[PDB]
Amino acid sequence: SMSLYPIAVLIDELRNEDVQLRLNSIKKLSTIALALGVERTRSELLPFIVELAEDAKWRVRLAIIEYMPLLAGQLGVEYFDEKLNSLCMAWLVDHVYAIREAATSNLKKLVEKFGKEWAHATIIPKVLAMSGDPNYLHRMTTLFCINVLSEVCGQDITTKHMLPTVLRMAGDPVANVRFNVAKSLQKIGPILDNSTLQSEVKPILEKLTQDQDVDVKYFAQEALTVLSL
Amino acid sequence: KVFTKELDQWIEQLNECKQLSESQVKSLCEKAKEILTKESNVQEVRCPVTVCGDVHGQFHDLMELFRIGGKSPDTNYLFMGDYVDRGYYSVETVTLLVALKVRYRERITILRGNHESRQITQVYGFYDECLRKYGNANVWKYFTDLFDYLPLTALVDGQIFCLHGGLSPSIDTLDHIRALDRLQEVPHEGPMCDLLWSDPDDRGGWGISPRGAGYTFGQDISETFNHANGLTLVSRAHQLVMEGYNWCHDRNVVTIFSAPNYCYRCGNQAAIMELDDTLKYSFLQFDPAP
Amino acid sequence: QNFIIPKKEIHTVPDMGKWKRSQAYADYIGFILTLNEGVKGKKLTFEYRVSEAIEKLVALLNTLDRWIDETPPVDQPSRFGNKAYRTWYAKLDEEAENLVATVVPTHLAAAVPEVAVYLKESVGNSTRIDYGTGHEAAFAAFLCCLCKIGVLRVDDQIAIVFKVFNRYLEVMRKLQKTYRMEPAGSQGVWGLDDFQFLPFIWGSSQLIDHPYLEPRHFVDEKAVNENHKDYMFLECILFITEMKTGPFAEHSNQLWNISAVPSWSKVNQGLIRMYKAECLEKFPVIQHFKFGSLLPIHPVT
Numbered sequence: 001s002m003s004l005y006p007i008a009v010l011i012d013e014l015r016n017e018d019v020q021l022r023l024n025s026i027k028k029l030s031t032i033a034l035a036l037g038v039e040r041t042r043s044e045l046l047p048f049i050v051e052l053a054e055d056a057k058w059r060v061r062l063a064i065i066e067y068m069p070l071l072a073g074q075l076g077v078e079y080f081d082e083k084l085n086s087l088c089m090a091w092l093v094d095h096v097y098a099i100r101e102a103a104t105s106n107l108k109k110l111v112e113k114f115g116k117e118w119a120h121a122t123i124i125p126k127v128l129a130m131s132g133d134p135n136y137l138h139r140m141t142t143l144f145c146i147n148v149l150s151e152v153c154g155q156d157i158t159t160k161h162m163l164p165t166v167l168r169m170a171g172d173p174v175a176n177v178r179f180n181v182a183k184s185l186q187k188i189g190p191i192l193d194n195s196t197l198q199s200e201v202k203p204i205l206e207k208l209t210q211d212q213d214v215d216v217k218y219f220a221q222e223a224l225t226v227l228s229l
Numbered sequence: 230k231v232f233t234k235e236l237d238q239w240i241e242q243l244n245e246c247k248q249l250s251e252s253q254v255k256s257l258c259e260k261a262k263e264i265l266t267k268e269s270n271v272q273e274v275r276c277p278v279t280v281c282g283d284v285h286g287q288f289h290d291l292m293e294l295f296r297i298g299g300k301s302p303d304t305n306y307l308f309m310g311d312y313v314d315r316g317y318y319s320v321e322t323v324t325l326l327v328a329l330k331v332r333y334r335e336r337i338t339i340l341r342g343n344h345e346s347r348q349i350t351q352v353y354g355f356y357d358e359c360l361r362k363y364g365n366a367n368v369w370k371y372f373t374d375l376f377d378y379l380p381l382t383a384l385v386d387g388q389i390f391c392l393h394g395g396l397s398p399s400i401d402t403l404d405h406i407r408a409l410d411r412l413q414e415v416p417h418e419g420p421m422c423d424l425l426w427s428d429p430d431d432r433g434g435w436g437i438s439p440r441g442a443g444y445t446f447g448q449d450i451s452e453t454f455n456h457a458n459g460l461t462l463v464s465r466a467h468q469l470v471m472e473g474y475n476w477c478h479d480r481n482v483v484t485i486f487s488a489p490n491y492c493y494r495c496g497n498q499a500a501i502m503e504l505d506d507t508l509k510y511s512f513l514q515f516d517p518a519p
Numbered sequence: 520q521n522f523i524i525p526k527k528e529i530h531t532v533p534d535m536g537k538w539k540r541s542q543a544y545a546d547y548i549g550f551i552l553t554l555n556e557g558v559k560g561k562k563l564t565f566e567y568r569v570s571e572a573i574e575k576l577v578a579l580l581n582t583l584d585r586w587i588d589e590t591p592p593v594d595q596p597s598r599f600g601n602k603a604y605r606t607w608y609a610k611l612d613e614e615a616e617n618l619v620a621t622v623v624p625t626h627l628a629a630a631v632p633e634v635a636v637y638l639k640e641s642v643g644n645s646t647r648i649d650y651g652t653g654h655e656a657a658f659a660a661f662l663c664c665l666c667k668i669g670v671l672r673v674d675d676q677i678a679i680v681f682k683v684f685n686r687y688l689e690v691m692r693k694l695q696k697t698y699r700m701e702p703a704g705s706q707g708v709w710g711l712d713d714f715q716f717l718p719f720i721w722g723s724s725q726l727i728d729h730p731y732l733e734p735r736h737f738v739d740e741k742a743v744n745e746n747h748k749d750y751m752f753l754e755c756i757l758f759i760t761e762m763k764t765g766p767f768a769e770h771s772n773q774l775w776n777i778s779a780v781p782s783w784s785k786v787n788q789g790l791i792r793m794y795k796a797e798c799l800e801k802f803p804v805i806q807h808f809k810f811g812s813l814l815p816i817h818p819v820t
């Protein structure tokens with residue numbers, strides 16, 4: 001079916017010094033890897049996909065992040081966990097925001113593909129690990145992730161595993177993290193039950209309206225209004 | 230607020246690279262002046278924050294910058310001037326940075342560069358651009374009047390000194406700078422002039438600037454000023470850098486330039502400096518938008 | 520006669536009127552317009568006369584070319600410009616008067632110190648590693664001085680532009696490439712070019728009343744390559760397509776507008792107005808002009 005494919009020509013294009021040919025060969029992978037089958041892409045294509053995951057140019061990295069959900073879909077959940085989970089996590093810590101932003105959207109698409117129970121097992125912890133990062137740019141990623149993930153994780157996982165972290169980060173030294181707690185609570189709120197909302201969310205937001213910082217105040221007040229509290 | 234909705238859509242509108250109307254621009258500058266008046270000559274800035282250099286009207290490259298370092302207000306920014314002139318989009322570029330200031334005054338600091346004046350904006354394009362995009366000189370009025378209010382310098386965590394140009398033989402301390410009256414057109418000579426015009430160079434002591442304005446200063450002057458004011462670093466812009474950022478004077482001074490491939494000619498990288506929660510510096514180099 | 524070293528005189532923005540009303544200005548502009556008139560409608564390969572003074576000015580420029588060969592770019596870290604430019608310039612500083620004295624006859628040897636200053640100001644800034652239209656102007660001023668002292672004559676008017684000024688551009692282009700020089704006072708998307716202005720004026724003069732080449736033809740790659748050997752304007756376009764990135768309409772905005780001008784006539788006409796408006800009336804350029812006995816600051820007489 002594809003045992004006469006000139007795969008050597010493709011590999012030269014993936015490892016090419018010219019950036020444009022790297023990007024153009026990545027655009028093929030989606031269709032090519034399907035026709036080439038699980039075994040051949042795993043043995044013949046995957047070592048080059050892994051290289052490109054950490055390419056010097058961020059736009060090449062971005063294209064791999066966008067191809068990731070299809071590649072995981074083809075390769076199945078069991079193999080993803082052993083070779084590809086690390087790639088996806090290392091992206092959330094990337095120096096370039098655009099790469100951080102896209103690795104977040106990626107987590108969402110993977111959860112839709114593999115389901116919420118798998119997310120609890122293999123994703124949620126690694127995301128929460130970042131909440132203790134010395135860098136505010138990284139600590140914020142945790143919240144951006146929680147925003148995106150709470151949708152597809154359902155009420156319970158959100159309440160038990162994601163919510164306590166958000167509430168803890170309300171006491172962060174950095175205001176940017178603090179107002180992003182207010183924004184997160186506005187986003188994840190409608191998913192939680194009213195008891196949880198009235199008892200655990202409402203007191204935190206009210207304390208956040210007493211914050212020194214103007215932006216924390218505003219977004220805290222805005223969350224209270226939106227969630228009707 | 231009724232005016233926060235308005236501001237929010239302006240920011241949204243400007244991110245699509247669409248200019249505000251003359252009427253809108255007028256209101257924006259009026260409310261910006263109120264905020265800027267309360268700002269000190271040496272404006273107090275708290276880390277964490279990202280320090281940027283020259284943009285010279287390259288709006289799409291400014292968008293690339295926010296793709297690299299994160300968008301406002303999530304990421305704290307500090308700009309060291311030269312927003313206008315030379316590029317196609319001085320209006321959109323400067324309108325957005327001003328918009329964001331009025332919206333999140335604690336999340337951004339915008340400093341005055343030498344290009345932020347009535348004299349120079351009539352030499353290098355900003356006047357022309359306004360006239361062509363608005364049909365009259367009014368927008369140029371509202372902006373050049375606003376430029377008089379931009380703080381001359383900034384101080385992050387009391388330890389990192391930020392300004393466009395460089396040091397002045399007339400200024401020994403940060404108090405001399407606070408004493409100054411900044412609320413005027415950038416003068417032809419003197420301390421205010423030097424802060425926005427000066428350059429470091431490779432020979433010792435002071436030197437009259439080849440630019441015809443300001444002075445050039447050597448490593449010993451940098452060493453004296455830093456030590457005397459308890460500073461670890463002078464962060465500045467005002468000069469093209471092939472690598473985006475350039476160390477000099479034994480790491481007493483850093484030059485940051487944020488206009489990649491300057492004049493479609495130079496093929497330089499642009500850079501920004503991220504300052505940690507703990508004031509540690511790191512640099513991000515980037516090329517232009519594709 | 521009676522010569523002095525040229526010094527700066529425009530120190531403030533109010534000093535810009537003094538310049539406008541000066542003898543130097545009247546002479547300079549009148550000198551540009553003269554050369555402009557002499558080359559109207561003529562190709563670079565036109566048959567004109569070449570004197571001893573001209574052939575020795577070319578040699579001068581060849582000596583400067585030779586020094587770039589003998590002063591390669593150093594493999595050191597630098598801000599932007601390559602530090603080897605300073606080594607090169609220091610050679611022009613030491614040897615300028617000697618090079619000029621090979622062009623000026625021994626009876627007018629007293630004029631060498633004044634005239635050599637303008638050449639020293641015509642190749643970019645040593646400290647900034649710069650080149651701008653101000654340096655280009657200094658070279659025109661240099662040439663202007665050689666006329667006022669009679670070294671160059673009326674018959675040399677075509678040679679000055681086609682041989683001497685044209686060779687000068689090759690040497691500057693080389694300098695800009697080799698040492699990675701940056702633009703002094705580029706107006707960006709609002710200026711004509713980052714580095715040059717004058718060749719666009721004289722260049723368009725050649726193309727006045729051209730049988731088939733109209734301003735729209737210089738944004739056509741093929742027309743340029745087939746004709747640049749003959750026209751200075753097109754050579755400048757060739758360097759821009761060689762040195763700049765993107766579509767033409769992007770990098771060279773003002774020139775893209777000019778291609779939409781009906782005739783080379785109006786191009787030459789407009790460029791003269793623009794040159795006065797954007798170079799000769801802009802303080803950050805004029806502040807660096809130098810005035811002596813030949814091009815003086817005293818009101819026009």
Ligand SMILES: Nc1ncnc2c1ncn2[C@@H]1O[C@H](COP(=O)(O)OP(=O)(O)OP(O)(O)=S)[C@@H](O)[C@H]1O
Binds near residue numbers: 439440649650702703
């Ligand atoms: N057309 C010109 N030709 C030669 N020199 C010039 C010209 N225009 C200005 N200059 C001088 O050369 C210096 C360098 O010019 P630029 O760096 O391009 O502009 P600048 O305003 O000095 O720098 P910026 O844009 O503030 S970072 C200026 O300070 C002027 O003294």
Ligand SMILES: [Mn+2]
Binds near residue numbers: 311467468
């Ligand atoms: Mn600048």
Ligand SMILES: [Mn+2]
Binds near residue numbers: 342343393
């Ligand atoms: Mn500047």
